[model samples]
Target chain A: SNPGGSQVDAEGNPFWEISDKRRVGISQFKKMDFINIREYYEAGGEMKPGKKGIGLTVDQYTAFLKAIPAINAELRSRGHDIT
Target chain B: SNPGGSQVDAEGNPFWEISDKRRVGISQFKKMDFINIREYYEAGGEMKPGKKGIGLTVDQYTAFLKAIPAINAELRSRGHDI
Candidate 1:
């Protein structure tokens, strides 16, 4: 994947010096593993599969979908389209 | 000099496209050759070498310096220092 722009510290130092604390946000999986339950259903496992089972609660799926639209909108505004 | 990021079209398309015009601002030399007169003075040639000659009018020099600080400030704001 293309790395956009320079690798910089939170304070914006160009090239590394003796002191720098480069902080980055953690990955989605690590930040929101609570939602991984949906992954099992996506993996084709029997989740609330039969009439008695529920694949994914409406709230969980809606939250996941809603979380993505804003990111897509931002990317589009910046002249990119999510594949 | 370091090339900071990918060269992109004005519309932000990457890797180029046949249809992309890819316009960019002209260099300072091309945009404002009138200012090059200051370079001769800074080069230590002989502006008025003696007296009546003004090196750079205060306003011209000030405009050049002031234009740069904002660019420096933007770099600093983005985690880069001058």
Candidate 2:
């Protein structure tokens, strides 16, 4: 279910597409690594980064991961029914 | 500086436009609240939420805000000049 390493895209980042133009991936920018949840647009026959994304620094990403339990707790309180 | 709280769009959510087609806002959906960083697409002269966005539960948003300082520290250690 990991989609395997073969899914690395042309940008050399492993990505998962959540919609036709939205993707989440890990990438490097100017020597800083980022966990990006970005929207892509087609240009010259390839998907390119658009202006509609947020790049989370690796530490921020880790923080988000650690915060998931709390997030779920609040969500469940609101009747989200999440697992 | 706060956009004067007059920027609530047609959806009744207070929003900040970050780009021509991207925005961040707070909204309620299905009785649950979310902080959304989303892209918008115009349809029939009105901007609508597109598929290329994420909704953060309010708790997640607070977590991210609190994580900012640590994020900056890591960035500095990485020679990011941040």
Candidate 1, residues B2-81: lDDT per residue as tens digits? 12222332333322111122111111223331111101122344221112111222233333233333334433454443
Residue A81 in candidate 1, Cα distance off native in Å:
53
lDDT of 2 by residue, B3-81 (tens): 2232478766666555667666667888878867676899999889897767766655554554445445544555664
DockQ of 1: 0.01
DockQ leader: 2
Chain A TM per prediction: 0.24, 0.80
DockQ of each: 0.01, 0.09
**Candidate 2 segments exceeding 4 Å error:** A1-3, B1-82
- Which candidate wins on TM-score? 2
lDDT of 2 by residue, A1-83 (tens): 54213246677776655566766666778977886766689989888888766776665555445444544554465566545
- Candidate 1, TM-score of its B chain: 0.24
